[PDB]
Design an enzyme around this catalytic site. Structure first.
Site, PDB file in Angstrom:
ATOM      1  N   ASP D  57     -16.586  16.940   6.472  1.00 16.95           N
ATOM      2  CA  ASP D  57     -17.171  15.764   6.531  1.00 16.95           C
ATOM      3  C   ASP D  57     -16.548  14.973   7.674  1.00 16.95           C
ATOM      4  OD1 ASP D  57     -14.862  15.979   4.878  1.00 16.95           O
ATOM      5  OD2 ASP D  57     -15.253  14.045   4.001  1.00 16.95           O
ATOM      6  N   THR D  90     -22.098  11.062   6.747  1.00 10.28           N
ATOM      7  CA  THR D  90     -21.289  10.578   7.770  1.00 10.28           C
ATOM      8  C   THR D  90     -21.563  10.992   9.238  1.00 10.28           C
ATOM      9  OG1 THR D  90     -19.767   9.930   5.998  1.00 10.28           O
ATOM     10  CG2 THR D  90     -18.774  10.137   8.441  1.00 10.28           C
ATOM     11  N   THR D  91     -21.716  12.398   9.085  1.00  4.25           N
ATOM     12  CA  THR D  91     -21.921  13.133  10.496  1.00  4.25           C
ATOM     13  C   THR D  91     -23.209  12.678  11.052  1.00  4.25           C
ATOM     14  OG1 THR D  91     -22.831  15.068   9.721  1.00  4.25           O
ATOM     15  CG2 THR D  91     -20.509  15.040   9.473  1.00  4.25           C
ATOM     16  N   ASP D 388     -18.601  13.727  -2.972  1.00  5.72           N
ATOM     17  CA  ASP D 388     -19.826  13.614  -2.336  1.00  5.72           C
ATOM     18  C   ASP D 388     -20.864  13.812  -3.453  1.00  5.72           C
ATOM     19  OD1 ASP D 388     -19.375  13.048   0.407  1.00  5.72           O
ATOM     20  OD2 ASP D 388     -18.536  15.076   0.708  1.00  5.72           O
TER      21      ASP D 388
HETATM   22  N1  LIG Z   1     -30.001  24.770   3.820  1.00  3.52           N
HETATM   23  C1  LIG Z   1     -30.473  23.799   4.783  1.00  3.52           C
HETATM   24  N2  LIG Z   1     -31.134  24.224   5.772  1.00  3.52           N
HETATM   25  C2  LIG Z   1     -31.436  23.322   6.932  1.00  3.52           C
HETATM   26  N3  LIG Z   1     -30.899  22.017   6.592  1.00  3.52           N
HETATM   27  C3  LIG Z   1     -30.171  21.363   5.731  1.00  3.52           C
HETATM   28  C4  LIG Z   1     -29.817  22.637   4.580  1.00  3.52           C
HETATM   29  N4  LIG Z   1     -29.011  21.919   3.724  1.00  3.52           N
HETATM   30  C5  LIG Z   1     -28.908  20.672   4.135  1.00  3.52           C
HETATM   31  N5  LIG Z   1     -29.515  20.524   5.184  1.00  3.52           N
HETATM   32  C6  LIG Z   1     -29.661  19.229   6.114  1.00  3.52           C
HETATM   33  O1  LIG Z   1     -28.390  19.011   6.458  1.00  3.52           O
HETATM   34  C7  LIG Z   1     -28.052  17.753   6.575  1.00  3.52           C
HETATM   35  C8  LIG Z   1     -26.836  17.310   5.732  1.00  3.52           C
HETATM   36  O2  LIG Z   1     -25.609  17.918   6.524  1.00  3.52           O
HETATM   37  P1  LIG Z   1     -24.039  17.588   6.062  1.00  3.52           P
HETATM   38  O3  LIG Z   1     -23.083  18.598   6.553  1.00  3.52           O
HETATM   39  O4  LIG Z   1     -24.081  17.048   4.761  1.00  3.52           O
HETATM   40  O5  LIG Z   1     -23.940  16.215   7.306  1.00  3.52           O
HETATM   41  P2  LIG Z   1     -23.708  14.778   6.632  1.00  3.52           P
HETATM   42  O6  LIG Z   1     -22.118  14.942   6.350  1.00  3.52           O
HETATM   43  O7  LIG Z   1     -23.758  13.896   7.874  1.00  3.52           O
HETATM   44  O8  LIG Z   1     -24.349  14.453   5.407  1.00  3.52           O
HETATM   45  C9  LIG Z   1     -28.990  16.862   5.670  1.00  3.52           C
HETATM   46  O9  LIG Z   1     -29.734  15.922   6.419  1.00  3.52           O
HETATM   47  C10 LIG Z   1     -30.149  18.212   5.367  1.00  3.52           C
HETATM   48  O10 LIG Z   1     -31.341  17.570   5.463  1.00  3.52           O
END
Ligand SMILES: Nc1ncnc2c1ncn2[C@@H]1O[C@H](COP(=O)(O)OP(=O)(O)O)[C@@H](O)[C@H]1O
Ligand SMILES: Nc1ncnc2c1ncn2[C@@H]1O[C@H](COP(=O)(O)OP(=O)(O)O)[C@@H](O)[C@H]1O
Ligand SMILES: Nc1ncnc2c1ncn2[C@@H]1O[C@H](COP(=O)(O)OP(=O)(O)O)[C@@H](O)[C@H]1O
Ligand SMILES: [Mg+2]
Ligand SMILES: [Mg+2]
Ligand SMILES: [Mg+2]
Lengths: 187, 106, 61, 522, 529, 521
Positions: D57, D90-91, D388
């Site tokens: 994260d 966050t990312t 989270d």
């Molecule tokens: N299986 C998946 N395939 C494609 N995109 C995904 C999948 N699962 C989550 N996401 C996308 O990834 C993002 C979340 O990634 P994450 O690592 O949680 O980033 P952050 O920490 O910024 O939320 C979300 O915007 C979601 O739309």
């Protein structure tokens, strides 16, 4: 502060070079209790036995309480025969000067605050003959009669900002003279 | 040692002397003292049915004592783990060989 | 200026109750007039907070 | 040697600083670019104090990074903002903020005043929030399966995804158990009443949320019972020994029956306190402060289990779980302050420590996760993922709206406000469409992370998205393929998405407003 | 091509000052060599002909001794294998009292022969099992070598002749005098029923004339001086006090409160009256002398002077406990003049001048007491210290003799006999470990050989003669130290023997040390702070 | 890679170490060799504080050196032990040990063995001690004047070779009188001595009573009479001074005349103590604790003497001189506890005021008032008187005495040479070396006297071969003469102890072959 003690269990470390049981005296050494491990217990009891023994030994030393009632006729006995190693803080004063009244009251508070050192207070005129009124507030400390610090002055002493800084200025001796001014600077 | 003695000698730990009765005394079949060097030890043995025993380690030097202590800890933990669940695995690396063969088959 | 001195032991414990009860009393007076929100500049120790929670009022220190 | 300013003052001004500002932001967007998506890569950080933090994260990554450029400090601040407000994205917000600053750099270089760029950014933010709220799909709170799906979607991108079907449930239970109401106020206070406790050594699927409170204490006396069926919990704030008081006393003794009398009075006072605490016939007593030996003797005489010094937070959790009330004066303890509702009290032994459980409560409003694993870092990571999931579940509970994930919402709002832009006439259209294409970074980052040719895949995504009723069409990062999020079942709470867009645009505006830097002074 | 980098592994992650040794050559032979050097350091101080050593410890305090344990203790040893060897030696000293140099020599010889075996081709485990098997065999065969047990432990001549051989190793020149003196001291304290104690034999060192003027008394001697005015008492009725000789004071701070003039005038008079009443009550029981554990009051001293009481002050709890034991009294924490059962009796309490050191003497006259004291005389503090060490070793040998006595021949007889028997046993074993067995033979050969080389005589000739006589069947012969030529002498007639328990423990500890230092295969040393 | 001992330890295995130790012993003994014999010389030693000590006794000189060599430490310790045991002969024993080592070194330069050397030394020294015990002459009469003359001669020969040799007969007599008037314990603290700057040497006096410097005087002194013809000495241990009653008490009253009564009661306590002192019939008052100005004025008004803050030793000497007893309570000042002296006087000698109690008949303690030019002068006189005191005290028990001047050493050497003819082996050579080393004393003495050592020593050896014993050196006539007839008499115990200690130290030094020096942590 006691508020940090209840905010959260996560208070891991911040400006703590050493954190062991050897420096917890009495007040805090008994508030952890259950956090003192078990393998190092016997060392904890040895340390507490030794340090309570030292405190008991100092009980015979730290019983003076408050100010006393010495005048000029009793000066020599209580500045040359008051004891071996016992600090004596001679005070020369007269009724009427306000700054010396301030320092007298602060010294009186120190008397109960610190009973290890029994300072003595004497009237300026009937302790030393022909003492000028330009030296109304006078304090000098020594042990065994060897006068160490004899700062003189009505306004150079600064009795308005005396409190803790000059409290320890009188208290701390037998070393560097300038040792506690930086703690509570006037600025 | 309060808990260990009240489970071994059979008495009861007391925080005050408000009431004393013969039921508050444990029993010991032999209590004696052995002086080693300058230190002294008290042995309390010959109990009728101890629920807490002790392991006395004797060594010609400190590092032997620490090695024996580590060995005793590991052995006691192994026996306790054997007691907890009624099961045990073949040793000498046999289980790894069989598990790897099964993984290759799968 | 005021400091207590105890000569016979029996008189001791009583004053200790007083050493808290005074505070207690004031709280009920503040709580006697239907007050349910307490704001104060000074700090509030644990016992007074217990009085406020038992009564049902909130205390802000 | 005449100096108007100090000797340590340094002034920097003009285009250069603006460029530098953008660069700094992009640098932070360059660190966490590979941690986004279900195919994220672990990142290991070496603590200055000697520890190790292995996370994915963004906020737990940027908290251990020390940066001297002030724009980098603002980026770390927006990361902390996103962590604190909604707990997710966050990312995402860091990446968007960096890339919007980068795309504004082009207009900055082309002798365009930053105020029009700021105004265009504000207009784009308003429009993107509106069109993100437009495409929301309502959620049903009572549907446990739907909430499990939402939490699984939020958690599948992190470490515990392997045990997702377990951990998900845990989170839901906690968020459904801290839920509380009093005087017409709802709390869901995860921070204070949902404690997560990590014990190294064990199995991941051995972890569980308890119907009660577990703390790391032990009975003060060996003979106190370690197994209670239906305890009557009473909580204490004060101590149960004799204390000096406040006012100076200095008692004076002359008679021969005053010393022993004083000691007997101390013992009598302790006995009175113990009898008064026993009068309500409790079964387990918990105190924040110490217990004197005589006090626990008297408690033993009435068959009462006493626990010594306990932190205030643990006592608040115990009071909330048992329904009890913390009291300071045992003289003023009523019946309604005695906690009935705890269904078991276990003094169990784990490893080499004693842990006490007050599990199986009637309807506890505070829980505790016995989180068992293999190492401290692994449990710390699982702790972060659980936080989270709790934040996401709380956001869904407080807001019944959802929005497709996987990059579908980004492209949807981009296309919508691009179609809006293609009508308005003026000079502000170019930064507006720049923001429109700026939101395209999330699908691009996902495709780059899964390892697919981003150019034609993203072009095909845009082309398929141009067709109507296709705003849920996103990219599957598991295999990097154009899919429908409706069939893939990935949706994120609207709160996270709108908060991310809002704070990203706001911090881009902040860093885009500044053109002078003065460094060095006290 | 000018720098060789570290290996990609444990060598690169190791800290700066740490050192890692691993392998047969890099970790084991180093330990063997260091232990061999340590053993050869003290080998020169073996037996009656061993030479004294001066060591200046880290606080610049001279030590002149041939005691192996003291020599190893004074100089700090840094190699870890040598540290294990000295721990084994110190444990042998604590458990027995004599046998440290034997431990060093045997362990060094064992390690040297183990290095030879490892060079030959045997594995470390083979050598370890061989050594343990041969150690079991040696322990089994040792009880069959005893001869001429004591059976009395109360005849003065017998105990003197039995301790003369243990004393002889250090104070070779003056051997009979010390033996007779220590025999008197140990016999006069030997209780009829119970266990002998070595803490109850005390030694007092005072500068003065030669060794011939050292004496023994059936009491104990202090270096204090009487605080009163009377110095000689006959038939002393000693009263021992664990509290200061003063009116007892509350341990809680208590201040005298005066409210009228007459109270102020009469307070001092009342205090003095109470003090003299207490002192008169003490003296009416018959207490000629009084010993106190703390401060003596001026008023108390004056009133003791008034009633002819010798006031003695002791400044150590152990001193007071020993005084109570030797006089038959018991310390009590209140004045409370002693009752008839808890009041010690002594023949006399001298105040004496001997070596310009005023002393107070609690001597008895009818050869009794649980404590006896040796007064040592010498012209140098360090020489008297060496005499004290010799006395302590002799007394420890006596205490070991109170246990299983079973005296065994010394002077190379026992070790050579054991070596011959171990060779005979190892000739029968057909396995690969036989070589290791056949090594204790050589390990025993280091003991008589040193005895030869320290006496300025050839060692191989003495060893060959010893084998000749032992194969002839005479198992009581050994080295003769006055011959000036390689010669043998019967060791039973000479009456110079060793305790069986001492040899048993020495062999056991030496074998244990050699085995546990051979087991080490890797060493990881952190940088010293 | 790894070392056995800590870096810094250096060893000296082998016979070169013991040869070097022998050399160091001779280098030490060279620093005392010239302070021996009646024509001796003093030595001045300055330390890092700049305080110079001038002396010619081996013990003090060796103390004042910053010795660190272990063998040199052994020689320092032997000198100290000889000084503590007998009283003199420290130079003799040091020289004897060094000469033993020197005469044995050529034998050990070819290895040999330390054990046979120490065995030969032990045999030779026990034979020498037996010879000294056998040949020492005993008066066996138990007379009175004869024994006093014997002690006077021993004291006279002790004082010779000291700073005050020219006044031998004046001091010896005097000092023996001191030892003649002690109880049958010879408590050294009862011969306390005092030194006053100024005055010639012959003015030193022996106070048969007790004389000590005046301690202090408050406002009120010098009105007391300073000459009492039959006073009653009161030896006190109480503080006759207005002061706090307890240093722990506290007064709590609430009325003014109570305050007045309290101050009057304090004054009444002081005056009651003083009144008991006065009514006890005493005339001179001595106190260990301070005596206040009020007490001094009260005593002056009563026409009587007071002197407080007297040291422990002075009060003890007064008590065993005037016949009183120390009292810390003035409540029982009976007539049996006071001290009585014939004459008391507060006189002024040498710019210092001194109190004299002279005329006590049953006085068991004395005092020396020593006069000199410089502090080191009177200190060296003190050391010489101490040596004489020790010699006479050791001679009180037994009148067994030999003749000094090297005669006893020559006789012992002749006896040991005769012994080293009937024994074979290297033991005879070692005993011959021991005997030849035993003759250093006359040779060094005549070397100090600036004589021809070889010829006079040959004369001594040839005379001790046959003709008569006790023939030693004679510095005044530069010849040999009968020392016993010359009334130079040294008690046999000092020679016995010197030989025993010297042999002990030589055996200890030879019996080492290894030295380790750790790095001084
Ligand atoms: N299986 C998946 N395939 C494609 N995109 C995904 C999948 N699962 C989550 N996401 C996308 O990834 C993002 C979340 O990634 P994450 O690592 O949680 O980033 P952050 O920490 O910024 O939320 C979300 O915007 C979601 O739309
Ligand atoms: N007269 C003698 N002849 C031969 N050997 C002797 C004689 N006296 C003693 N010994 C031997 O000298 C050895 C002394 O060893 P010792 O120095 O006491 O060892 P440690 O220092 O380990 O106690 C004894 O084993 C004894 O056998
Ligand atoms: N008048 C004398 N005639 C001959 N020999 C003397 C005379 N006085 C002293 N001696 C000798 O000088 C030697 C040294 O004595 P001295 O220097 O006084 O003390 P120490 O013996 O301590 O050196 C003595 O052995 C003594 O015999
Ligand atoms: Mg997320
Ligand atoms: Mg030995
Ligand atoms: Mg002399």
């Amino acid at each position: 502060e006691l508020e940090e003690e209840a905010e959260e269990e996560q208070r891991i470390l911040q400006q703590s070079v050493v954190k062991t049981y050897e420096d917890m005296t009495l007040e805090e050494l008994e508030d952890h209790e259950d956090e003192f491990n078990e393998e190092d217990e016997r060392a904890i009891e040895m340390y507490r036995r030794r340090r309570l023994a030292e405190w008991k030994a100092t009980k015979l030393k730290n019983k003076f309480g408050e100010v006393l009632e010495i005048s000029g006729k009793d000066y020599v006995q209580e500045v040359t025969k008051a004891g071996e190693g016992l600090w004596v803080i001679l005070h020369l004063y007269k009724q009427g000067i306000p700054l010396c009244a301030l320092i007298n009251q602060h010294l009186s508070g120190l008397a109960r605050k610190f009973p290890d050192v029994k300072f003595i207070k004497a009237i300026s005129t009937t302790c030393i003959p022909n003492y000028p009124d330009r030296n109304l507030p006078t304090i000098f400390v020594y042990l065994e009669g060897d006068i160490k610090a004899q700062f003189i002055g009505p306004l150079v002493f600064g009795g308005m900002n005396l409190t803790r800084d000059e409290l320890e200025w009188k208290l701390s001796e037998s070393g560097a003279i300038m040792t506690d001014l930086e703690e509570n600077p006037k600025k | 040692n309060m808990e260990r003695l009240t489970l071994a000698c059979g008495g009861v730990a007391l925080n005050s002397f408000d009431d004393l009765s013969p039921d508050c005394l444990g029993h010991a079949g032999l209590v004696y003292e052995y002086t080693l060097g300058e230190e002294k030890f008290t042995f309390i043995e010959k109990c009728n049915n101890p629920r807490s025993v002790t392991l006395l380690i004797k060594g010609p030097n400190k590092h032997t004592l620490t090695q024996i202590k580590d060995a005793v800890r590991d052995g006691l933990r192994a026996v306790k783990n054997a007691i907890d669940d009624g099961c045990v695995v073949p040793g000498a690396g046999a289980v790894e060989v069989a598990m790897a063969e099964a993984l290759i088959k799968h | 200026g005021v400091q207590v001195v105890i000569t016979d032991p029996e008189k001791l414990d009583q004053i200790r109750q007083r050493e808290s009860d005074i505070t207690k009393e004031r709280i009920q007076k503040i709580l006697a007039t239907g007050a349910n929100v307490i704001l104060t500049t000074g700090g509030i120790d644990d016992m007074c907070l217990k009085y406020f929670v038992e009564a049902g009022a909130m205390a802000v220190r | 040697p005449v100096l108007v300013l100090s000797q340590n003052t340094k002034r920097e001004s003009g285009r250069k600083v603006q460029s530098g500002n953008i660069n700094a932001a992009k640098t932070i967007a360059d660190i966490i670019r590979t941690c986004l998506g279900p195919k994220s890569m672990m990142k290991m950080l070496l603590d200055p104090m000697g520890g190790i933090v292995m996370t994915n994260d963004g906020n737990a990554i940027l908290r251990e990074i020390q940066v001297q450029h002030p724009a980098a400090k603002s980026m770390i601040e927006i990361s902390r903002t996103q962590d604190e407000e909604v707990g997710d994205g966050t990312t995402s917000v860091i990446i968007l903020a960096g890339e919007m600053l980068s795309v504004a750099e082009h207009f900055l270089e082309q002798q365009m005043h930053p105020t029009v760029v700021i105004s265009a950014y504000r207009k784009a933010l308003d429009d993107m929030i509106s069109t993100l709220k437009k495409i929301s799909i309502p959620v049903d709170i009572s549907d446990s399966d739907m909430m499990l799906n939402i939490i699984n979607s939020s958690i599948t991108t992190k470490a515990i995804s392997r045990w997702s079907s377990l951990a998900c449930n845990i989170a839901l239970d906690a968020v459904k158990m801290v839920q509380f109401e009093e005087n017409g106020r709802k709390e869901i206070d995860i921070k204070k009443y949902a404690r997560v406790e990590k014990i190294p050594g064990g199995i991941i699927e051995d972890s569980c949320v308890l119907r009660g409170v577990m703390i790391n204490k032990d009975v003060t006396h060996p003979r106190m019972r370690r197994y209670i069926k239906n305890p009557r919990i009473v909580l204490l704030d004060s101590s149960l020994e004799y204390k000096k008081g406040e006012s100076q006393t200095d008692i004076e003794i002359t008679r021969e029956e005053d010393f022993t009398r004083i000691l007997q009075m101390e013992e009598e006072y302790i006995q009175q306190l113990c009898e008064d605490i026993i009068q309500l016939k409790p079964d387990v007593v918990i105190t924040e402060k110490g217990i004197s030996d005589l006090a626990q003797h008297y408690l033993m005489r009435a068959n009462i289990t006493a626990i010594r010094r306990v932190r205030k937070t643990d006592n608040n959790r115990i009071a909330r779980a048992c329904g009890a009330r913390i009291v300071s004066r045992p003289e003023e303890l009523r019946e309604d302050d005695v906690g009935t509702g705890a269904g078991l009290l276990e003094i169990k032994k784990i490893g080499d420590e004693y842990f006490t459980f007050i599990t199986d409560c009637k309807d506890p409003k505070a829980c505790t996760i016995l989180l068992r694993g293999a190492s401290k870092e692994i449990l710390s990571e699982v702790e972060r993922n659980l936080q989270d999931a709790m934040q996401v579940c709380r956001n869904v509970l407080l807001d019944p709206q959802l929005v497709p994930g996987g990059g579908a919402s980004e492209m949807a709002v981009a296309h919508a406000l691009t179609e809006k832009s293609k009508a308005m006439t003026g000079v502000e259209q170019w930064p507006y469409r720049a923001v429109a294409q700026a939101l395209e970074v999330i699908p691009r980052t996902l495709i780059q992370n899964c390892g697919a040719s981003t150019i034609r895949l993203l072009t095909s995504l845009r082309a398929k998205h141009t067709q109507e009723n296709c705003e849920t069409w996103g990219v599957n990062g598991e295999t990097g393929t154009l899919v429908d999020m409706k069939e893939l079942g990935i949706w994120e709470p609207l709160a996270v998405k709108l908060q991310t867009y809002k704070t990203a645009v706001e911090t881009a505006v902040l860093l885009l407003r500044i053109d002078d830097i003065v460094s060095g002074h006290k | 091509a000018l720098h060789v980098p570290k290996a990609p592994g444990f060598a690169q992650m190791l800290k700066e000052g740490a050192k890692h040794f691993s392998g047969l050559e890099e970790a084991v032979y180093r330990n063997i060599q260091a232990c061999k050097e340590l053993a050869q350091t003290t080998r020169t101080a073996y037996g009656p002909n061993g030479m004294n050593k001066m060591v200046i410890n880290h606080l610049e305090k001279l030590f002149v001794t041939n005691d192996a344990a003291t020599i190893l203790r004074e100089l700090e040893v840094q190699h870890p294998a040598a540290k294990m060897i000295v721990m084994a030696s110190h444990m042998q000293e604590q458990e027995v009292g004599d046998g440290t140099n034997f431990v060093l020599v045997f362990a060094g010889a064992l390690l040297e022969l183990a290095e030879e075996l490892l060079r030959i081709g045997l594995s470390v485990s083979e050598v370890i099992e061989g050594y343990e098997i041969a150690c079991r065999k040696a322990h089994e065969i040792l009880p069959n070598l005893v001869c001429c047990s004591a059976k009395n432990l109360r005849d003065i001549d017998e105990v003197s002749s039995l301790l003369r051989t243990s004393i002889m190793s250090k104070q070779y020149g003056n051997e009979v005098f010390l033996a007779k003196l220590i025999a008197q001291a140990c016999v006069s304290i030997f209780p009829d029923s119970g266990h002998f104690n070595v803490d109850n034999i005390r030694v007092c060192k005072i500068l003065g004339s030669g060794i011939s003027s050292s004496s023994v008394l059936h009491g104990m001697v202090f270096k204090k001086e009487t605080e009163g005015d009377v110095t000689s008492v006959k038939d002393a009725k000693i009263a021992v006090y664990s509290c200061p000789f003063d009116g007892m004071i509350t341990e809680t701070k208590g201040t005298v409160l005066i409210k009228t003039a007459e109270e102020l005038m009469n307070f001092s008079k009342g205090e003095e009256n109470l003090m003299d009443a207490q002192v008169k009550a003490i003296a009416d029981t018959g207490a000629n002398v009084v010993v106190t554990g703390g401060k003596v009051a001026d008023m108390a001293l004056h009133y003791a002077n008034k009633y002819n009481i010798m006031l003695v002050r002791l400044n150590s709890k152990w001193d007071l406990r020993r005084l109570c034991k030797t006089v038959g009294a018991t310390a009590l924490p209140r004045l409370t003049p002693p009752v008839l059962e808890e009041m010690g009796h002594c023949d006399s309490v001298y105040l004496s001048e001997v070596g310009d050191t005023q002393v107070v003497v609690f001597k008895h006259e009818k050869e009794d007491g649980a404590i006896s004291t040796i007064v040592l005389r010498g012209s140098t503090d360090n020489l008297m210290d060496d005499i004290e060490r010799a006395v302590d070793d002799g007394v420890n040998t006596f205490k070991v003799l109170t246990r299983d006595k079973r005296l065994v021949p010394g002077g190379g007889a026992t070790e050579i006999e054991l070596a011959k028997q171990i060779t005979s046993y190892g000739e029968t074993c057909p396995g690969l470990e036989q070589y290791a067995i056949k090594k204790f033979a050589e390990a025993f050969e280091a003991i008589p050989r040193a005895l030869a080389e320290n006496s300025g005589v050839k060692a191989n000739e003495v060893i060959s003669k010893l084998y000749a006589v032992h194969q002839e069947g005479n198992k009581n012969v050994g080295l003769d130290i006055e011959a000036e030529v390689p010669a043998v002498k019967d060791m039973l007639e000479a009456g110079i023997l060793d305790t069986y328990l001492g040899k048993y423990w020495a062999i056991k500890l030496a074998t244990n040390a050699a085995v546990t230092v051979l087991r080490v295969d890797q060493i990881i040393m952190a940088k010293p702070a | 890679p790894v070392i056995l001992l800590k870096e810094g330890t250096d060893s000296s295995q082998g016979i070169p170490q013991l040869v070097s130790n022998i050399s160091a012993c001779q280098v030490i003994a060279e620093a005392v060799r010239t302070t021996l014999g009646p024509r001796g010389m003093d030595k001045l030693i300055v330390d890092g504080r700049g305080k110079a000590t001038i002396s010619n006794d081996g013990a003090t000189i060796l103390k004042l050196l910053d010795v660190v060599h272990p063998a040199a430490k052994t020689l320092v310790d032997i000198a100290k032990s000889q000084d503590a045991e007998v009283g003199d002969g420290t130079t003799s024993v040091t020289l004897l040990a060094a000469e033993f080592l020197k005469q044995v070194k050529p034998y050990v330069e070819e290895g040999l063995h330390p054990q046979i050397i120490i065995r030969a030394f032990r045999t030779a020294t026990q034979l020498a001690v037996n010879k000294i015990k056998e040949i020492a002459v005993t008066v066996k009469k138990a007379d009175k004047v004869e024994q006093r003359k014997l002690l006077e001669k021993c004291a006279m020969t002790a004082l010779s070779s000291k700073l005050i040799s020219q006044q031998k007969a004046f001091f010896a007599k005097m000092v023996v009188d001191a030892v003649m008037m002690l109880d049958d314990l010879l408590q050294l603290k009862m011969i306390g001595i005092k030194k006053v700057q100024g005055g010639a040497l012959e003015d030193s006096q022996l106070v048969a009573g007790v004389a000590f410097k005046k301690t202090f005087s408050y406002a009120g002194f010098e009105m007391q009479p300073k000459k009492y013809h039959n006073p009653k000495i009161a030896l006190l241990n109480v503080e006759l001074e207005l002061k706090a009653e307890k240093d722990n008490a506290e007064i709590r009253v609430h009325t003014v005349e109570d305050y007045q009564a309290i101050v009057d009661a304090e004054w009444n306590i002081l005056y009651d103590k003083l009144e008991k002192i006065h009514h006890s019939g005493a005339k001179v008052v001595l106190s260990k604790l301070p005596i206040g100005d009020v007490a001094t004025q009260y005593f002056a008004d009563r026409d009587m003497f007071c002197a407080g803050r007297v040291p422990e030793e002075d009060l003890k000497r007064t008590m065993m001189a005037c016949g009183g007893s120390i009292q810390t309570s003035v409540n029982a000042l009976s007539a049996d506890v006071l001290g009585r002296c014939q004459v008391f006087e507060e006189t002024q000698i040498g710019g210092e005021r001194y109190n004299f109690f002279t005329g006590c008949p049953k006085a068991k303690t004395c005092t020396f008032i020593l006069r000199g030019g410089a502090e080191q002068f009177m200190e060296e006189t003190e050391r010489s008187l101490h040596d004489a005191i020790m010699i006479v005290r050791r001679a009180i028990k037994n009148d067994s005495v030999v003749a000094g001047g090297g005669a006893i050493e020559m006789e012992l050497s002749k006896y040991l040479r005769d012994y080293s003819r009937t024994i074979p082996g290297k033991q005879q050579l070692l005993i011959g070396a021991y005997a030849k080393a035993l003759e250093i004393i006359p040779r060094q003495l005549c070397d100090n006297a600036g004589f021809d050592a070889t010829n006079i020593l040959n004369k001594l050896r040839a005379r001790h071969a046959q003709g008569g014993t006790w023939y030693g050196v004679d510095i005044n006539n530069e010849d040999i003469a009968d020392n016993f007839e010359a009334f130079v008499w040294e008690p046999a115990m000092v020679r016995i102890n010197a030989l025993t200690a010297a042999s002990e130290a030589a055996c200890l030094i030879v019996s080492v072959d290894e030295t380790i020096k750790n790095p001084r942590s």
